Every structure is written in structure tokens, then in C-alpha cells.
Amino acid sequence: AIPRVAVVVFILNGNSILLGRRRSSIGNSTFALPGGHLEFGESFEECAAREVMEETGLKIEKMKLLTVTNNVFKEAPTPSHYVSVSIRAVLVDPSQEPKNMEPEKCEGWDWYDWENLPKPLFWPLEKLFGSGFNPFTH
Amino acid sequence: AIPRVAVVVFILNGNSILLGRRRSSIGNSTFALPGGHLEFGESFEECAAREVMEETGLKIEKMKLLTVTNNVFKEAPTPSHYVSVSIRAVLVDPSQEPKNMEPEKCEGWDWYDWENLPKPLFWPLEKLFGSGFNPFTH
Numbered sequence: 613a614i615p616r617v618a619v620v621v622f623i624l625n626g627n628s629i630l631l632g633r634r635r636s637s638i639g640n641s642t643f644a645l646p647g648g649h650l651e652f653g654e655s656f657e658e659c660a661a662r663e664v665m666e667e668t669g670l671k672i673e674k675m676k677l678l679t680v681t682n683n684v685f686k687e688a689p690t691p692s693h694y695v696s697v698s699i700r701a702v703l704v705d706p707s708q709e710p711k712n713m714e715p716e717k718c719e720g721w722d723w724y725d726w727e728n729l730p731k732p733l734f735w736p737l738e739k740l741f742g743s744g745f746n747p748f749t750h
Numbered sequence: 751a752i753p754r755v756a757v758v759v760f761i762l763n764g765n766s767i768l769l770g771r772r773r774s775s776i777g778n779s780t781f782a783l784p785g786g787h788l789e790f791g792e793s794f795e796e797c798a799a800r801e802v803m804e805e806t807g808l809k810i811e812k813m814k815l816l817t818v819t820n821n822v823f824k825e826a827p828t829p830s831h832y833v834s835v836s837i838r839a840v841l842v843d844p845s846q847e848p849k850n851m852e853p854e855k856c857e858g859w860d861w862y863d864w865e866n867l868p869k870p871l872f873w874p875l876e877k878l879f880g881s882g883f884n885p886f887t888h
């Protein structure tokens with residue numbers, strides 16, 4: 613029961629980002645970014661690339677730090693505290709399309725225009741966007 | 751062995767920040783900021799205020815998130831991995847002077863001018879400044 617580090621990735625593709633619905637004890641069915649737990653020894657950029665590859669099959673590059681958010685999940689099966697480091701990234705091959713590589717954790721990935729985001733967003737993401745955060749400018 | 755979250759605080763005082771030489775198995779004798787481990791359920795701001803109080807006796811306000819750095823310490827007696835969340839702040843009372851509340855962890859605290867910093871900086875802090883990071887503007 614300590615805070616744990618997650619990296620989440622904004623894959624900027626045109627005016628769109630990649631989101632998919634979680635299959636999870638936490639935030640089930642809400643739209644969230646690809647990402648996951650930072651491994652011991654791993655840089656943010658390597659973790660971003662690796663998690664995105666594991667979850668979506670996509671090859672990304674130009675990983676750049678955006679910000680960090682503190683996410684305490686009060687009403688969870690087990691009390692959870694995650695510190696979320698956000699990374700922006702772009703596709704290596706601009707023609708690539710995601711695949712749902714981990715259907716046990718995600719309903720599927722799709723591109724969503726920044727101006728037409730889906731709902732409900734995973735609540736840390738809703739709160740981050742509600743603050744005015746924009747990965748296309750930040 | 752997993753990554754652990756720490757909060758470090760830039761206490762801004764005129765043109766100067768608070769630094770002290772570490773007593774520690776990691777970065778011993780290098781100049782570092784006040785800070786410490788984030789506790790479960792705690793916000794970055796609460797942790798910042800608590801750690802500066804525990805370590806320096808100083809009272810800080812106007813905390814603002816700056817950035818996050820990924821600090822892997824493979825050469826440590828026990829390998830360590832800290833994700834370090836930077837917070838800027840200022841003294842409630844600018845005349846208040848630091849006290850070395852944990853002499854077992856620090857040689858002592860002092861104000862150092864941004865333009866004339868001591869050496870050696872704890873290398874996460876030197877890497878951060880080498881990036882062009884400035885806690886007064888940022």
C-alpha cells in the first residue's frame with residue numbers, strides 16, 4: 613500500500629488520440645489511454661514504448677514528457693494510489709493501426725478527435741482535461 | 751524492487767534555493783533539495799509541506815507542481831529507483847531561517863543563488879538543470 617508509478621501515453625495522430633475502454637476492477641468501461649506500470653530500472657520513454665507495443669501493437673517514437681498526476685482511488689476493491697506520468701508520442705509508421713493485443717484488459721482501441729472525445733473518460737483523465745490540459749500544445 | 755515516488759521541493763527565496771549536502775548511501779555529500787517519500791493517499795502538496803517541515807522546520811506555501819524526473823540508482827548498495835516529483839514553493843515568512851532537523855540525513859541547509867550554485871549537485875538535480883530547467887520561470 614504505497615503509491616505506484618504508471619506511465620500513460622498520448623499518441624498524437626493528426627487531431628486525434630488513442631483511447632479504449634478499460635476492462636478492470638478500476639474505471640471499468642471508461643475510456644483511457646494506453647499505458648501501464650513502470651518497471652524497475654526503466655525510463656519513462658522505454659515504458660511508454662513497451663506498454664504501447666504490448667497493448668496496441670503500435671510502434672511509437674518522439675516520446676516527450678507532458679506532466680504527472682496523483683490519482684488516489686478511494687472506492688476500489690483494494691486501496692490504490694497511482695502516480696501517472698504522461699508522455700506524448702507519435703507513430704513511427706504513419707499508416708499503422710492498433711490491434712487489441714490484451715482483450716482481457718481493454719475492449720478495443722480507437723482514434724478520437726480531441727474535439728469529439730468519447731464519454732465516460734476514466735476519471736483521472738476527465739480531471740486532467742477539466743484542468744485545461746491539452747497534449748497538442750503543452 | 752519497484753520504482754518509488756519522492757517529492758522534492760524548490761523553496762524559492764529571492765534568487766536562491768535551499769540546498770543541503772546529503773548524508774546517505776546514495777549521493778552522499780552532494781547538494782540536494784529537501785524532500786522525501788510520498789505516503790499513500792497523500793497529495794504532492796501535503797507531502798512537500800510535511801517533508802520540508804520534518805527536515806528544515808520551514809513553513810512553505812504556494813506550492814506549484816513543476817515536473818517529474820526518473821532517477822535510477824543502480825550503483826546503490828541496494829539498487830533504487832525513485833520517480834521524483836518537483837514542487838516549487840516559498841516561505842510563509844521570508845525571514846524564517848532553516849534548521850537541520852535530521853542531522854543523520856543532512857549536513858545542513860543553506861540558501862544558494864541560482865546563478866552561483868554549489869558543487870557537486872546530486873546528479874538528478876544536475877541533470878535537471880542541464881536540461882535548461884529553471885524553477886523560478888517554469
Ligand SMILES: CC(C)CCOP(=O)(O)OP(=O)(O)O
Binds near residue numbers: 663694
Ligand atoms: C489503475 C491504473 C490506471 C494505473 C496502472 O495502469 P494499468 O491498468 O494500465 O497497468 P498495466 O498495464 O501495467 O497492467
Ligand SMILES: CC(C)CCOP(=O)(O)OP(=O)(O)O
Binds near residue numbers: 756786801
Ligand atoms: C534519492 C531521491 C531521488 C528520493 C529520496 O529522497 P530522500 O532521501 O530525501 O527520502 P527521505 O526523506 O524519506 O529520507
Ligand SMILES: [Mg+2]
Binds near residue numbers: 626627
Ligand atoms: Mg498536429
Ligand SMILES: [Mg+2]
Binds near residue numbers: 647648649663
Ligand atoms: Mg503492465
Ligand SMILES: [Mg+2]
Binds near residue numbers: 648
Ligand atoms: Mg500494459
Ligand SMILES: [Mg+2]
Binds near residue numbers: 646647648667717
Ligand atoms: Mg494498461
Ligand SMILES: [Mg+2]
Binds near residue numbers: 784785786805855
Ligand atoms: Mg530528506
Ligand SMILES: [Mg+2]
Binds near residue numbers: 786787
Ligand atoms: Mg520520508
Ligand SMILES: [Mg+2]
Binds near residue numbers: 785786787804805
Ligand atoms: Mg524525510
